[PDB]
Amino acid sequence: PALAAARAKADELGQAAREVRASVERQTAYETRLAAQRSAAAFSGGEPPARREAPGAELDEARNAQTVSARLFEGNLKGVAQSGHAMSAEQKQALQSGLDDVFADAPPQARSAGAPMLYSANAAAGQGMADSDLWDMISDQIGKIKDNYLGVYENVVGQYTDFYKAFSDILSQMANWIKLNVDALKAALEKLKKDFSLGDNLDNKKAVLFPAQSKDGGIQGGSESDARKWAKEMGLPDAPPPGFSCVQKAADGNWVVVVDMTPIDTMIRDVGALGSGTLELDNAKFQAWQSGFKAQEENLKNTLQTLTQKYSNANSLFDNLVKVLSSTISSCLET
Amino acid sequence: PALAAARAKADELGQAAREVRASVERQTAYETRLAAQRSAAAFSGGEPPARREAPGAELDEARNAQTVSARLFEGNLKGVAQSGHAMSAEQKQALQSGLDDVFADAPPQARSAGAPMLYSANAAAGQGMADSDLWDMISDQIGKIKDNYLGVYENVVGQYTDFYKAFSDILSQMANWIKLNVDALKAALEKLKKDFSLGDNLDNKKAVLFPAQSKDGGIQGGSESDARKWAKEMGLPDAPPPGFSCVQKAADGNWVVVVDMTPIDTMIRDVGALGSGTLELDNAKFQAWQSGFKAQEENLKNTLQTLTQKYSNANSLFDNLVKVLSSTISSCLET
Fold this sequence. Notes:
2 copies of one chain form a homodimer.
Chain A: H1 3-43, H2 62-82, H3 89-103, H4 108-111, H5 115-126, H6 131-174, H7 182-195, E1 208-210, H8 224-233, E2 247-249, E3 255-258, H9 262-273, H10 286-333
Antiparallel strand pairs in A: 1-3, 2-3
Helix pairs in contact in A: 1-2, 1-6, 1-10, 2-6, 3-5, 3-10, 5-6, 6-7, 6-10, 7-9, 9-10
Main location (chains A, B): secreted
Organism (chains A, B): Chromobacterium violaceum (strain ATCC 12472 / DSM 30191 / JCM 1249 / CCUG 213 / NBRC 12614 / NCIMB 9131 / NCTC 9757 / MK)
GO cellular component, one term (chains A, B): extracellular region
């Protein structure tokens, strides 16, 4: 019946997601190169340093078709539940086969997101669970999987890209600071540090990688446990005081995953012990630092791509998932 | 009956709003002075330029009690409708008296927000409108008034304060640029311009004063008419091409009210014709510009306070409104 209404949106979601993905995959790529051609320009006197975005603008017309097609689809699945369709036992085995491939060799924080759905699969597939109950638990998890797992990464990358975008903005201005304006350079890095780190009030949301943050609302962290789980999966340092850890407490009392500042923290210091003053550099210490600075640009660049790669994979999983739920739906409808 | 549940939240809203208000009224005040003590410090060699916020942080624990107490209250009013209370005709006259004082001598974009409610007032007050119908239209408008009118200003100021916050961040770095680093100074102003102006894609939301913008969603403007209506009320220039206007079209096709850039646009030029180069200034042109620059800081400062004052007033109106709806509710409950 309304299987068609579900199968239609299924594809719509599939597209919207893939576009968003490609949108983030494109912005990241552009930024990465822009940064490069801004640093080189800064040191190498040479060409000048600036940014123009193409339809590789993640948020825009992209992230929206994904949210609306996801909502509808989740609802439509609540409809497929209401009908009295009785999936041949040979189909449930397919939905169950499809769910496996989807969450088979995938990391830990992913299996946790695909556990409940995978439980329902084996449930009605060979133990005995009413279809209606199956479809619901499904319309339920697609949303939770999109919100908790896929939404996490999308926010993580978005939040991280704003930080990386602000960093590249400093390289552009660095051009006019270089023999050395160790002050303005060290002053900027300090600004990036402050702007993307919980403040003395632990209320700055711009520094939150997890969980997704409101726009005008207060900070909002989750249980200490949940913060660590994620910090780990996306490769961020958890190291206990006085060392550095991306897992920090907010004015919530709860926990958040913060932007890794060590790279900028290293730069904030290396640029320092070249100490101070607005400073004629030895052309041999200059290149002992320039390279000590570029070694950081590398790190930052690697985190952005890494987190970006973590995302696309997470996105490709959601896609394959919808695929399966679409193959099954189509199968049933074909009767 | 559930009049008590409505009267309780009524006060809760009253508080939450007043706190948010005082929160915005405090941040604005702090920033304004911080800016001052950052500019002076920049030119006058003197003291050094930086920011630490107190519970005058608008968004935080503030803007949240207001959203939740507003929701509940709006719902509770939907409850008062369901009961069979029959407001003496002497009360409706009071609710009607209270609504007048609230929207009496208040500006235009305000009467428009208090029109429907004021229509219901005269309606059941002396013409004949079923109470149930009255309470609903009321539970309806409190939300629309909070969203369309009060929410508009809260967003406007929030959006404007981020711009003004970024400007003051430039004054701090300007300190290390001053004889003159006309490049880094002119480079920053250019960055503030770009960061708070629709780009070549007309997709930058950080430059939107109206309407409220999503966080990760696409731009979203309203009808051309609606954009002008607001631009006017909050004192922003509407001037048609090639002049400058805060009313601009987005990648929506629709209309948005943008941050007034003229002040920074003037600075972007004055700092220029002191033209170029990273530049020994005559100590007499220096102070012919310093003062030409401070004359702008003034403007910016005046807009922030103005928009901030426009807000508090708008906030004080919402408050008085809730007051009235609370006086009436209490009156009925007292029977």
